[PDB]
């Protein structure tokens, strides 16, 4: 990404991709590495009532 | 003073030999998304050397079932015929001035496949024969291909001497008549030297290593320097052949700077194409040079006949 | 840290010149880094020890140990149990 | 990054840029400011012996001019 | 002490430095942890930067990465192409596999380790290590025969 | 449903300029200079190489590296010698020998994992109740003999001493995940 | 050069697998998947689980499943990019193994930030997967995926209308239709041939019923029309990526039922069924009611199944592990006849052969 | 002379290095170490039977063909001739004979390999 003009445009002619669109170099774009912390949701078989082992 | 001459020539052939090896490496890793060799000296400088050095402090390999004498005749020869090939080119004055300069070439280069045999031969092993008879074939197709194209182009220039090259570039390069020749000529140089995709002797995936496959240390080392350094002299060749660099005759350094970057350019080239394709089938390797090649070169060399007939542009004898 | 650079090299370490006693001028390693810097260096976390450090507790080494293999303090395996048969011990008197 | 590759690429231009620069220098140093004769010919060869003779001191390369003619 | 001595010991030094600079392993592999091997050849951890470049035939091969699980119909082959290799030579084992047998040690056809058929010089554990632990190896290994002094050991015989 | 990768549909007819198109195509090389120019690209390109060991590649707090043994932060052990992590070990590669300690505390005296044997696969670390057997991020920890890869007790209780200021803080960021 | 018999001697990675597996209780067992076909990790993970819940008669959850099926995408193109790759590897051509592993170290970095290994993730279980996937990790799948395919375009432009790709690769192990049906052949392999076949399609699983994709078809049945039919799979396999990111459904991701998965770490600290529960599954497991089932996924390299037989215990009393590459390389002979050392070579490559699910 | 020194000096050179090549490391050679390669196996038989040429016809062709070679090399001072109209007929006819004969090889499937 620090790449300048000049190369940026042969890096192009010699590829026919515009390459700067699509990096394979990762930057900015990504998660952050510290996230806030999840809350998880429950299955369908936590309930307090009508949940016998039983019938499932 | 003669004998200073051959150092100069001969040692800084071998630095830039080691040196080719060291942008071969960083030329593949920056064209493979990654750096190549920059710890080992500053930028990786001193990677050679101390390859150079493992190489030569390893200890050799002597097989029982390997022929002993010509085991150890075949990597010395290739090593003596690549600094001999190395020795009459004109950059623009050559160390050994002679007159069949490019008869001398061929000769050293079909002496260097000898080498290969006898090397694949004496190392008794299956694919080191494996190595041999593919380097037969790719022999017998560059050697009759490269040889009408080098007659060709000759006749041409006039002259089997390469300072008549130069004084028949003196004004244009011979890549603008002869550019059709000039490309089977660059391909035939990368068949005689072995490169991908015509490497086809020390294969790798194919066979385990080839001919040097028994090689181990100091001989494998002669041979890999014999090869590389053969890699800069014919891309030397082609440059004073077919791109001509600007000779005056009150400097020759120009010459020499012209001749430095276009060889330079022609060697990145050849690291360039290793880099780009997949390696040929060795049949199809004879295939295309007995007929796509051969018939054109024919064809290109009753041309190159009939042009200075017809033009009355027949080259000078001197 | 350097942010306009791509996704790994972002971040690095210049080794120290000595660390425990040995001379890593040149023997630079890879387990030179004590945890905290180890984990924002290999990028667990966006924070550095310096604005979040990590909880203190007594038991925790105040000096961080690198690979010490094939050196005096390398670690040696040993069965960390007791003996489990006790054998009978002959009377020190003779009988008669 | 691409430019990394330029300290090898230099080091090859010298030591490319070495050999026919020293040939041409010494060459001309072994020939007294001239360059080497070429004698790819039987004529010029002759005209070589010829010089060594002449010189008097047996070096074709220290050519007589008008001060050897009365 | 001796100049000699001295001398000596730089001698090891070059040697050492030439013998680490230029580390050749034989195209070699065995299973996951050898595809964890090519990973490090890849472009992220660059062998090749470091100097290391894979050879095919094991005359030209330094040392010896046995990356996967070395099993009986297999160790012949492996004591064979250990013993083609020339002198200085060294072992990597690579993963549980190579270094006790791993997730097959009560197998009747694995080898618990391949130190029971080779001397391995550096032990990585993990399956697989990551190319960072292999590479992590690769200089551990490097500093080992930094370490080595032979010619002071022959000046001192 | 599906699709042809290589079978062509009809017939383009012959053309003179079709005809020279592809004598030019065939003559000159065409697509592999093309195949020259995607190389030269990737050449003018940035490498996707760091300078390991002073740059490393990113890891998430999941990662399973090596062994420890962690305490309260009281400083007990938090293993309890149920031998769970012995019983659910894929590999075998723990073994644990166990009595009364002198206050009545039921812990281990012998908590050996052969690292040689451990496929590293963290079941040990999900199946202990009391969060004290870990695979802290260390991965750097390659040994010249056999022998040093045979943790025993008090090899994991270093490692969990040693470790403890990062563990603690990768199992505070992944254990609302688990 | 000419080649007039392969023989093909194998069983040099055999490590008596399937004895370890009726050894071993079923998570136990669940980690040698991970090494059968260590390019296909997650693949074989899916095809062990979906066996094992064919037999338990239960059904992971919907958010599980479409986690399964994005990461077995994610691992089709992994095995393609290595089976693509390193066949250019062995005809000659190293540069897209270079790019195409960068590419795989990025989705090793996805691995590992599922399930802390790059490689055998053990993340894919009988009741769905082992953890919720982090915050994040969608985004960094789509940044990924969006700037892949030209990538492909990459390689492909490199080697599909080359030349020399092609005289390496056209008519070379050629392969009819019958015989490669008679063979055993599955997955690129009849597709190369010609035959309509994808299990995917035919036989779904999962929400493969639910995703939608086309199926690469070959007509000349040789080295050529495989690797096109891997390419174009591989971009098939980023549109199934793009199509799992966007339905991606909120809900748990173990099967709620604590007798055949655990219960969460907070559950088990603080209930004494959920701790009953982890203690059991974690030391005995659970009874796999007796039965034999045979369940097929349709692996990269083509069917790879599970013959299991449950004696009513917790451990597995028969697991026969059908590899694709076992049919595809006793098939090698066959495809060789007529051929060169390099054409064996370029056939072994287009085989896409794997050795640990070939030795078990 | 000049050209025979340096030929001598390159000799000189090669056999320095194979010489300190292999009197410079230690030696430590055995059995194992110096049997043949055969990627980790015993080879199953000697390298030195019969191994089966199907180029041979093309190698033939190759001999005939370099003669040709040797037949058309001395143009660039048969240029130099005063009946320019002779030598451009016999070098026509040569290169046209020459072609011909691949032509009618290429015809007959002798360029094809056998097998
Ligand atoms: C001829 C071209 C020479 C190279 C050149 O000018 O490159 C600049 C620049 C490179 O463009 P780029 O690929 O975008 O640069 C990479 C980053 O954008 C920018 O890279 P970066 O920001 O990461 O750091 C760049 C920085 C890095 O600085 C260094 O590396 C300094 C090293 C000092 C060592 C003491 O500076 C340079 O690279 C300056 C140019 C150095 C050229 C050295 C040539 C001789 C090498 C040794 C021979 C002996 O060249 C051009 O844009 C045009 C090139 C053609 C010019 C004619
Ligand atoms: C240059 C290096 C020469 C020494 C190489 C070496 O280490 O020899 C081992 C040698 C000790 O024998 P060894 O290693 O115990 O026996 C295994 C050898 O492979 C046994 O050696 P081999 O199997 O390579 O056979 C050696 C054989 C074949 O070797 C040669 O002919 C090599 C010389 C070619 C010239 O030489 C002879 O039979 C004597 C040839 C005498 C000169 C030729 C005179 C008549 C022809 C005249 C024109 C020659 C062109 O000293
Ligand atoms: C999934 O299934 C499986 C597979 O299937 C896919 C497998 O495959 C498999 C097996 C897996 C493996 C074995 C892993 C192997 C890894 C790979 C195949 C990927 C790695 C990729 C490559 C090898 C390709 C590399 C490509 C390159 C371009 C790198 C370049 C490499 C080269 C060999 C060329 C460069 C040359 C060298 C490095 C050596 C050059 C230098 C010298 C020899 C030095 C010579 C110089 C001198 C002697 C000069 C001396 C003279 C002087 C004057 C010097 C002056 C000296 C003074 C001291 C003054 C397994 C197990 C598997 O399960
Ligand atoms: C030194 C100077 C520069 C040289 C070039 C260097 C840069 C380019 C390097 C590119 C990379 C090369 C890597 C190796 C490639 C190997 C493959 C290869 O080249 O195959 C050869 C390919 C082979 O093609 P093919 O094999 O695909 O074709 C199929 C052929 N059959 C079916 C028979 C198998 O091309 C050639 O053989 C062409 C050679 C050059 C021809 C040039 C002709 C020019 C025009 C002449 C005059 C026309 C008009 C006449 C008068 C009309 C008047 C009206
Ligand atoms: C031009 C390109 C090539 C350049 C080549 C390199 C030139 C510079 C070389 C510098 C180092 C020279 C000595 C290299 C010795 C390598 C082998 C070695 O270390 O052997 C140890 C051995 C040690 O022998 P030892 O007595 O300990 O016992 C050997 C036998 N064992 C181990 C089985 C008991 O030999 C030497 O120490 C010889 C020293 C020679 C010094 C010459 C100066
Ligand atoms: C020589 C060329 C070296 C490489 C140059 C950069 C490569 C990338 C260029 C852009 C690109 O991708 O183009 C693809 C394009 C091809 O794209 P294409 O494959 O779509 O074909 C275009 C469509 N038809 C089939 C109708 C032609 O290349 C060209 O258009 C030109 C290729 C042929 C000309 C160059 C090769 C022959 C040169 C022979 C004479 C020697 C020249 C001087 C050499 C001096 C140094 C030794
Ligand atoms: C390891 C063993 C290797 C054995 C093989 C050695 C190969 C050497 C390199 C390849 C040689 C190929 C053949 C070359 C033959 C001569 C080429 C030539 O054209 O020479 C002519 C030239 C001068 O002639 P001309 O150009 O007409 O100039 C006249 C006006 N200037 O110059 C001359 O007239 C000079 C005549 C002599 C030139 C050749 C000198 C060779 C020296 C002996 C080498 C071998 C020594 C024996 C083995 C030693 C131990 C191994
Ligand atoms: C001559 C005698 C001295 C030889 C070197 C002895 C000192 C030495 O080994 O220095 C190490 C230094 C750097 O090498 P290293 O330790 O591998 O660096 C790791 C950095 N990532 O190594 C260097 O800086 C390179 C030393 C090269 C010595 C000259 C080699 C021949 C030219
Ligand atoms: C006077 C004679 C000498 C002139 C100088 C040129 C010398 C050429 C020498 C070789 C010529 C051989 C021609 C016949 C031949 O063998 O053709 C074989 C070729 C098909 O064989 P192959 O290339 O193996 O194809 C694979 C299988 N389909 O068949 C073909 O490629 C068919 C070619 C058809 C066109 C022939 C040329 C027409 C030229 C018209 C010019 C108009 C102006
Ligand atoms: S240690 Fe693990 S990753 Fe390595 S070869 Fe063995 S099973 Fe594969
Ligand atoms: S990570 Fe797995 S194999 Fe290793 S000790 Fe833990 S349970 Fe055993
Ligand atoms: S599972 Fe935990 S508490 Fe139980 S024996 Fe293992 S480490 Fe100790």
Request: aromatic residues 12%; glycine residues 6%.
């Amino acid at each position: 990404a620090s790449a300048t003009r000049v190369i940026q445009k042969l890096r192009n002619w010699a590829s026919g991709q515009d390459l700067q669109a699509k990096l394979q170099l990762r930057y900015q774009e990504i998660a952050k590495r510290t996230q806030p912390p999840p809350k998880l949701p429950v299955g369908p078989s936590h309930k307090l009532s009508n949940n016998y082992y039983c019938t499932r | 003073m003669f004998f200073i001459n051959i150092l100069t020539l001969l040692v800084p052939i071998l630095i830039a030999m080691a040196f080719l090896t060291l942008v071969e490496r960083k030329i593949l890793g920056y064209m493979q998304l990654r750096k190549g060799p920059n710890i080992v000296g500053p930028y990786g400088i001193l990677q050679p050397f101390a390859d150079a050095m493992k190489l030569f402090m390893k200890e050799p390999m002597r097989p029982l079932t390997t022929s002993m004498s010509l085991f150890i005749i075949a990597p010395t020869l290739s090593l003596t015929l690549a600094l001999s090939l190395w020795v009459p080119l004109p950059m623009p004055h050559p160390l050994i001035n002679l007159n069949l300069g490019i008869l001398f070439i061929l000769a050293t280069s079909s002496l260097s496949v000898y080498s290969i045999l006898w090397s694949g031969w004496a190392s008794n092993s299956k694919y080191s024969l494996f190595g041999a008879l593919r380097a037969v074939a790719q022999t017998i197709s560059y050697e009759v291909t490269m040889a009408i194209i080098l007659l060709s182009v000759l006749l041409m220039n006039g002259s089997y001497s390469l300072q008549t090259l130069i004084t028949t570039q003196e004004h244009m390069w011979l890549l603008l008549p002869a550019w059709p020749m000039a490309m089977m000529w660059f391909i035939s140089t990368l068949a005689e030297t072995n490169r991908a995709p015509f490497d086809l002797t020390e294969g790798e995936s194919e066979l385990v290593s080839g001919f040097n496959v028994e090689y181990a240390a100091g001989p494998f080392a002669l041979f890999f320097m014999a090869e590389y350094t053969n890699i800069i002299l014919m891309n030397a060749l082609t440059t004073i052949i077919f791109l001509g660099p600007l000779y005056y005759i009150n400097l020759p350094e120009l010459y020499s700077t012209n001749f430095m970057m276009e060889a330079l350019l022609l060697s990145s080239t050849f690291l360039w194409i290793r880099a780009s394709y997949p390696r040929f089938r060795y049949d199809q390797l004879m295939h295309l040079l007995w007929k796509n090649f051969l018939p054109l070169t024919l064809a290109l060399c009753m041309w190159h006949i009939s042009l200075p007939i017809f033009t009355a542009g027949v080259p000078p004898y001197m | 840290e350097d942010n306009k650079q791509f996704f790994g090299r972002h971040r690095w370490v210049i080794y120290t010149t000595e660390m425990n006693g040995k001379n890593t001028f040149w023997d630079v390693d890879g387990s030179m880094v004590p945890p905290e810097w180890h984990r924002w260096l290999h990028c667990m976390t966006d924070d550095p020890p310096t604005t979040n450090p990590p909880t203190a507790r007594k038991f925790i080494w105040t000096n961080h140990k690198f690979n010490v293999s094939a050196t005096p303090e390398q670690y040696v395996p040993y069965s960390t149990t007791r003996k489990k048969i006790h054998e009978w011990v002959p009377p020190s008197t003779p009988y008669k | 990054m691409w430019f990394e590759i330029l300290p090898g690429l230099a080091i090859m231009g010298v030591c490319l840029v070495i050999p026919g620069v020293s040939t041409a220098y010494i060459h001309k140093f072994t020939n007294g400011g001239k360059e080497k004769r070429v004698a790819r010919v039987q004529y010029q060869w002759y005209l070589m012996e010829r010089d060594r003779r002449i010189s008097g001191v047996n070096r074709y390369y220290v050519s007589k001019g008008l001060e050897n003619i009365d | 002490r001796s100049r000699a001595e001295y001398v000596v010991t730089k001698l090891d030094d070059l040697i050492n430095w030439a013998r680490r600079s230029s580390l050749w392993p034989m195209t070699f592999g065995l299973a996951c942890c050898a595809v964890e091997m090519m990973h490090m050849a890849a472009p992220r951890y660059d062998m090749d930067r470091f100097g290391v470049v894979f050879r095919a035939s094991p005359r030209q091969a330094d040392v010896m990465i046995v990356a996967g699980t070395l099993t009986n119909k297999m160790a012949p082959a492996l004591r064979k192409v250990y013993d083609q290799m020339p002198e200085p030579r060294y072992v990597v084992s690579m993963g549980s596999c190579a270094n006790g047998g791993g997730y097959y040690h009560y197998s009747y056809s694995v080898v618990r380790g391949c130190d029971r058929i080779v001397p391995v010089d550096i032990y990585v554990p993990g399956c697989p290590p990551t190319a960072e632990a292999l590479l992590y190896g690769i200089l551990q290994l490097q500093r080992k025969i930094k370490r080595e002094q032979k010619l002071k050991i022959w000046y001192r015989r | 449903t599906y699709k042809y990768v290589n079978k062509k549909e009809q017939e383009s007819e012959v053309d003179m300029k079709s005809a020279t198109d592809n004598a030019a195509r065939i003559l000159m090389w065409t697509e592999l200079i093309r195949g020259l120019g995607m190389t030269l690209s990737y050449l003018f390109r940035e490498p996707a190489t760091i300078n390991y060991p002073f740059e490393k590649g990113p890891l998430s707090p999941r990662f399973r590296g090596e062994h420890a043994l962690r305490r309260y932060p009281s400083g007990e052990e938090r293993c309890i010698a149920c031998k769970l992590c012995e019983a659910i070990c894929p590999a075998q590669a723990i073994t644990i020998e166990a009595e009364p300690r002198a206050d009545g505390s039921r812990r281990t005296t012998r908590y050996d994992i052969d690292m040689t044997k451990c496929i590293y696969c963290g079941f040990c670390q999900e199946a202990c109740p009391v969060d004290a057997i870990v695979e802290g991020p260390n991965f750097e920890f390659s040994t010249e003999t056999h022998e040093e890869l045979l943790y025993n007790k008090e090899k994991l209780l270093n490692n969990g001493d040693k470790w403890e200021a990062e563990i603690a803080a990768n199992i505070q960021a992944d254990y609302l995940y688990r | 050069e000419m080649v007039r018999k392969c023989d093909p001697h194998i069983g040099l990675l055999h490590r008596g697998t399937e004895k370890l597996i009726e050894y071993k209780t079923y998570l136990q067992a669940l980690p040698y998947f991970d090494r059968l076909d260590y390019v296909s990790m997650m693949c074989n993970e899916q095809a062990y689980s979906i066996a094992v819940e064919k037999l338990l008669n239960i059904q992971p959850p919907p958010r599980a499943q479409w986690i399964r099926v994005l990461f077995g995408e994610i691992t089709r193109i992994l095995n393609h990019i290595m089976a693509v790759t390193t066949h250019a590897l062995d005809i000659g051509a190293m540069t897209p193994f270079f790019w195409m592993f960068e590419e795989r170290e990025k989705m090793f970095e996805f691995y590992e930030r599922v399930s802390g290994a790059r490689m055998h993730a053990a993340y894919i279980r009988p009741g769905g997967v082992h953890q919720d996937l982090p915050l994040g990790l969608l985004d960094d799948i789509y940044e990924f995926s969006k700037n892949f395919s030209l990538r492909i375009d990459e390689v492909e432009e490199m080697l599909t209308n080359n030349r020399i790709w092609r005289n390496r690769t056209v008519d070379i192990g050629v392969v009819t239709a019958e015989d490669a049906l008679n063979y055993g052949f599955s997955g690129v392999m009849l597709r190369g041939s010609g035959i309509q076949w994808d299990l995917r399609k035919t036989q779904p699983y999962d929400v493969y019923d639910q995703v939608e994709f086309d199926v690469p078809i070959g007509s000349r049945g040789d080295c050529y029309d495989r690797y096109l039919c891997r390419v174009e799979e591989m971009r098939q396999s980023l549109r199934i990526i793009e199509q799992c990111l966007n339905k991606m459904p909120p809900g748990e991701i173990k099967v709620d039922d604590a007798k055949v998965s655990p219960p969460k770490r907070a559950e088990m600290k603080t209930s004494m069924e959920s701790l009953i529960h982890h203690f059991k599954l974690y030391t005995e497991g659970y009874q796999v009611p007796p039965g034999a089932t045979y369940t097929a996924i349709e692996a990269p390299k083509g069917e790879f199944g599970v013959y299991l037989v449950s004696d009513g215990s917790s451990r597995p009393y028969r697991c026969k592990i059908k590899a694709p590459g076992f049919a595809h390389l006793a098939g090698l002979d066959k495809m060789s006849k007529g051929h060169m050392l390099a054409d064996v070579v370029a056939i072994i490559g287009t085989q896409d052969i794997v050795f640990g699910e070939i030795d078990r | 002379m000049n050209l025979y020194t340096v030929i001598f000096i390159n000799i000189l050179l090669s056999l320095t290095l194979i010489l300190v090549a292999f009197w410079l490391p230690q030696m430590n050679l055995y059995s194992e170490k110096a049997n043949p390669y055969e990627c980790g196996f015993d080879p199953t038989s000697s390298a030195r039977l019969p191994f089966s040429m199907k180029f041979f016809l093309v190698a033939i062709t190759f001999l005939l063909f370099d003669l040709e070679i040797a037949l058309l090399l001395p143009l660039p001072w048969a240029i130099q001739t005063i009946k320019t109209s002779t030598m451009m007929i016999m070098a026509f006819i040569l290169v046209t004979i020459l072609s011909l004969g691949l032509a009618y090889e290429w015809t007959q499937k002798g360029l094809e390999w056998t097998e």
